[PDB]
Amino acid sequence: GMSNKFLGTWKLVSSENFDDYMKALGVGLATRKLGNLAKPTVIISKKGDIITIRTESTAKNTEISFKLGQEFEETTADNRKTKSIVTLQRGSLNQVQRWDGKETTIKRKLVNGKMVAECKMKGVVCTRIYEKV
Template sequence: MTIESEIVGKWNFVSSDNFDAYLKEAGVGMMTRTVATKLKPTLEFKIEDGEWSMTSISTFKTHVTKWKLNQSFDDKTADGRDVSEVFTIEQNKLVQNETGKNGGKDSVITRYIEDGKLKIVCDCNGVVATRVYEKAE
């Protein structure tokens, strides 16, 4: 199975490890980090005519990111950072390269399916967080 066929659909939050440290390294302020680390968002992935979308739904806010593979675009992250992004597929993983703007820091966010779960590995300057989701019924 390909990441494209496996990732499409809704995913429920299961667990998070080291997320606050990652957000802090990425330059996210304490108040936003405090809220973000308490949220248990649902993620929904869609692919239509080559355009991907990822919707993060939580009690705090809904954030939508849309992209085409291998095409750079400007975005504002859910935590308010201005970045330039490009999504690629490498070794059956969806890789999001964020380049910080206005002095912001760069991050790499890798998403892949392992044992039926969506694993999200966030890396900013070697500070790594892992988040796990399971497919919604």
């Protein structure tokens, strides 16, 4: 299953092409400002087979809880209502969000002790790197 190395508190130390990603998502202007400024902590935890990903920033949180492979309802930080699934592929924790006939993916993998999140929307690709705190 999910490597226990995902578990813990993660801090954003690098982000590339995130504005373009948000723009691809049709994110509102206020949300883009927030997104480009925020340097969130991501907390990954588990209770039995329920995995939780909590994202905390200065004055805004998001949280999802899920079982691998089981679709669930999600309200994203930019307020999309998506049907989402998190799966495990070759150690990569892969999230897909679907809404309005659209699709975006967030793939998280551990690389040299860091967590690398790759976001893709219509060929726009984001990379956000987290270090263990």
